[PDB]
Amino acid sequence: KKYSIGLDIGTNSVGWAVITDEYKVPSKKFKVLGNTDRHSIKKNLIGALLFDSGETAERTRLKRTARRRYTRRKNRICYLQEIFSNEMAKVDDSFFHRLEESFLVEEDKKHERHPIFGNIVDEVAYHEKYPTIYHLRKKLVDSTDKADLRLIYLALAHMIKFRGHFLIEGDLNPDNSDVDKLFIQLVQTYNQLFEENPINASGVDAKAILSARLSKSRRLENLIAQLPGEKKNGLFGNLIALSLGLTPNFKSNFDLAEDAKLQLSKDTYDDDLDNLLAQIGDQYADLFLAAKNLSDAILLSDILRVNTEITKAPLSASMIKRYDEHHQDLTLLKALVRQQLPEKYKEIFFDQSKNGYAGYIDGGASQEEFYKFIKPILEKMDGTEELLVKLNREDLLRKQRTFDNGSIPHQIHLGELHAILRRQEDFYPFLKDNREKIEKILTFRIPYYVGPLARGNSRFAWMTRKSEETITPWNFEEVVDKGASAQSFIERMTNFDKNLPNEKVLPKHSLLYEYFTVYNELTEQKKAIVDLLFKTNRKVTVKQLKEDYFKKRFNASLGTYHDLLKIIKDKDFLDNEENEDILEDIVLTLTLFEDREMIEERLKTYAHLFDDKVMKQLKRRRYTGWGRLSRKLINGIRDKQSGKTILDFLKSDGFANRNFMQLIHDDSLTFKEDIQKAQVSGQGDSLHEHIANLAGSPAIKKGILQTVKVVDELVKVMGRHKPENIVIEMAREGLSELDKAGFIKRQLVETRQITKHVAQILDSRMNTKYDENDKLIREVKVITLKSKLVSDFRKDFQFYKVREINNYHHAHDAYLNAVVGTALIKKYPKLESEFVYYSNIMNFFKTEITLANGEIRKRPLIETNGETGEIVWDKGRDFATVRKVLSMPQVNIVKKTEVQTGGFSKESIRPKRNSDKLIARKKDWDPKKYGGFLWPTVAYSVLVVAKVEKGKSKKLKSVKELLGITIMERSSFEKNPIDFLEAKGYKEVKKDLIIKLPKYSLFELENGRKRMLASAKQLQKGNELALPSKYVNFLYLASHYENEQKQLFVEQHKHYLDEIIEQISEFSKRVILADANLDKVLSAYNKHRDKPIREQAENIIHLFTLTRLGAPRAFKYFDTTIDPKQYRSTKEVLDATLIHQSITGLYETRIDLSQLG
DNA sequence: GCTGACGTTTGTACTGTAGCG
RNA sequence: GAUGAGACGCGUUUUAGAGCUAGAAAUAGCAAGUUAAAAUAAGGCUAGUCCGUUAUCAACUUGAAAAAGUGGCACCGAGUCGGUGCUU
DNA sequence: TACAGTACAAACGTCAG
């Protein structure tokens, strides 16, 4: 007999349901394997697979980047120490070894305690002479003294490590460092985006309003009070506030519906800024870059404020003069305190937990916590005004290692490098011989297009070698094949157009992209409009359109047409038609790279077009990002009837215009057929490659894979017979004949490309037969549904969903996918070109139709299709079946058992203490002496039966125990489990009996109670409530008590509130075992029953957190908060029935673990 | 979010200890 | 909304930065403090200025692995699946 | 020889990241 499937593919679950011709689900009796006494189990063929959500590579990428950064940093040091190696070995033989084991305690350390000089006199006197490394650094710069080589090393290393940033290109000049010149460039950028309401920098001295001895807020308001055209709430004002490192609300400016807060000091500023630009435009990107550059410049004028000489180590000198300022302010504060406020001293300067100077130096407090502790203490205190104003301009008792040190360029460290090096060349000859080598060590940066410097063994790299020898800062220029590496960067980094695959996506400031998007929005008058307006200003207002042309604002812009007209300065060149592709490749070099030499090497191909000054400016220009479209989509394909391209149709289209999405979607044109012919993957792909070829989140792709697997298993069930229909939903998180048809399309048809891709995967998986001709035979037809059809079925037919009760709702939604899609496909035979891979198509389920006049019109109760004579939907019989299935108490819910993968532990390194639970950070490093990590991630648990040592008599006591293999020791456990377990103290373990138990491994124990494994030390809730349809339909309708017969349905059935509460009571006594929670709940229901039914229901809807599957989690009922009963034990599952579940969950293998021992 | 860290806060083995002249 | 490449700044951890004074003291008073080295997943071998947190994974039989293979039907009912009748 | 003194091992909240 024929059957169908429906699937509810969410980000966290895949509902699956099997339905016969009649919409009823089967219920096969499945075979059970293993040592239990149930040889079979009856299961309904409906279910949902639950799984933890597929996460992005982003955090792995961030970690990987950190790992490379640290490795290259201590190669930078190793290169330094190699250069110093022989000559240090003379000047102080053990010095680099003393610096190597500096982290060690004295018993572990082979050499002396004090790392620099060995002895306590010279090292203490180093620190007295130099309390901060910047004292040594400015000494070595200022002072031609023949200083001890150890000190040379320490300053050079404190610059080669911690070398600042590489954002300023070439040398340091006032055109890219002075706050004045840059504020001038920022106002030019503001006036470039907004030619309306500009401002003039001539009234504002950014060297003295900015960088003044006042706060961010004083300087902001002094700046506003000298701008004629602006005000502190406005756009330019918030840009300066942000530059000032304050946190403005640009949503007040762009009139955004959600809030939009920005702070340049914040570590997620890039994400927030990117959301801001998705929301406001792309034109703003050079405005915000100029404001970021201004923040870095005023940060540089604030940090570099000592100016006693131009060569005079200006960073080190300021860190010193700050130490001077800090030690006088600290002498002042301590004296102030102990003479005029004699108590409270200890909480400030000794406590070490509180946010005073104790916690600020000695403990864990940051400068902002310290300012929020100290401000309430300088307030209500006298004589302290000089300190309070230092705190107000955030200068009070600053550290030298702060969050602001990321403003420091590498040219500052190179000038101090060069000063130190060629201040001591004439005393150390190897400092002259290798000064170019050390200056390369700090200056060298691997370019963005070369990647990791692999030797074939990297997944990530593409670097191409001109020589087979070891890469270095010095030999990089010749051992890397830069050209081949950059061509490999070109070919790896180009993404591909999802509309037309295997075609490179354009740079998003491509000029063919610009002409296209302006024309697309603007849909010979077009030609006149763009030549007169869009080629003459960056953003055409509709007032200008009417005044300049209708007499005789638009989002889209030719901004790069304007940039190039500004930069290369001859207009007749950019309007010239054969000059498109030179310029397409210029914008492509210029968006692809961020390196000076690679841009210059590629622009050298064009050195004959433009003069070396504008070429210099063109290489100084830089663009970022990428569009969603390829030139073969915009201007390559062409219609076979009319004989023009998409772009030509955008330019001329007759009397009636079409948008780009219509040039794709239009039936009449041949673009859609060419696109759908091209949509397949080149030369094909595997299942896994195809899902990694889809356009979506990894969680959705995980759902798509679990969908494919539950389908392949729902045909491994019921004898390899394929389903006649598969219905898919990707979950949501008058009229003329062509308009009646458009309202059918509006109802029935998926707009989201991911689901069509799912239908393609399932189709190509299921359908594998062919004619004598090339014609496909498709044994399965794959249906894509839409949630509104389902949700209308749910809402209209009193058939409601409220997802707090149980995870059955995923399975019920897939059953709803199955019945709605399978009724639709036999109701409408001729419409299978319209959803397989009268106008309100949903009305065939209805009993009665309410018309626009108010009147009522009836339908047949049995609903049938006239094109076949087939019965399709028997109201009151299929409608009754679906209510049975939604009520039905057994639904297979499988939490996918998963090996936990991820970080070895939580990231924070905890201090040293006598606890055994600490995870050693190295193998040499005893946690009792060094500290270490905590909260290791259990990768999987393992059931071990063994002897272990017991008592002072050292008995070999036999134990069955659940041991947590952590992610760290998974590799060693899987290398040899016997010797790992023997090293864990488990003796003569039974190898054939060892049972691997990943997270969410399921056990059944008593009275049907199921409990599942979070870890060898923690368990989670298994079962869930079968509340029959009446109770769930009630509790939706009651929680939505606030059509009126639906309110009366809730004032009737009052007792269902009591019945639901006693069913959850019964159940959680049976399964949840949180007695004091049920007692609180039953007595609180007695306490609060006088609250309205609507309030009752909405609180009981939250109360199912008492029963929901998985982790115990806190919840509330009116005034009362109920805390989780955490199952931090595992002793019982050792004698439970372990269940190994199939990915659908139908097939089972059950191990009664009590039989093991 | 939710596994586990880290205390308190109870519940189990081992040695003492018992009015006496 | 996927993914990748180059740098930074901190943060943490241990160590070094002589503490002093008393006095039986489980440390009180005072003084000090700003910095640095090192490590930043353990580590791995093809030994690279690389790789190590994404994806993937119920169980059983073959297979180094890749991978393939493993569970009768229908009915009547439903507390998470229970029961009856044919069949091998 | 039953209970007392008391050194020792599971369980039960709030943090912690």
Author numbering: 3 to 525, 543 to 571, 586 to 766, 907 to 1010, 1039 to 1243, 1252 to 1366
Quoted passage from the original study:
CRISPR-Cas9 is a powerful tool for genome editing, but the strict requirement for an NGG protospacer-adjacent motif (PAM) sequence immediately next to the DNA target limits the number of editable genes. Recently developed Cas9 variants have been engineered with relaxed PAM requirements, including SpG-Cas9 (SpG) and the nearly PAM-less SpRY-Cas9 (SpRY). Here, we combine structural and biochemical approaches to determine how SpRY interrogates DNA and recognizes target sites. Here, we show that SpRY binds diverse PAM sequences by forming non-specific interactions with the phosphodiester backbone of the target DNA.
We revisited our largest cryo-EM dataset of SpRY in complex with NAC PAM DNA to search for any minor species that may represent non-productive complexes. Surprisingly, when we re-performed 2D classification using a larger particle box size, we observed a subset of particles that were much larger than anticipated. 3D reconstruction of these particles revealed the presence of a dimeric SpRY complex, with two SpRY gRNPs bound to the same DNA substrate facing opposite directions—we refer to this structure as a “SpRYmer”. Within the SpRYmer structure, the first SpRY is in the product state, with both TS and NTS cleaved. The second SpRY is bound to the same DNA molecule through its PI domain but has not initiated DNA unwinding likely due to the lack of substrate complementarity. Dimeric Cas9 has been observed during target search when two PAM sites are proximally located. SpRYmer assembly is stabilized by direct DNA linkage, and by a kissing loop interaction formed between the nexus stem loop of each gRNP which was not observed in the Cas9 dimer. This unanticipated structure further supports the propensity of SpRY to stably bind to DNA irrespective of sequence.
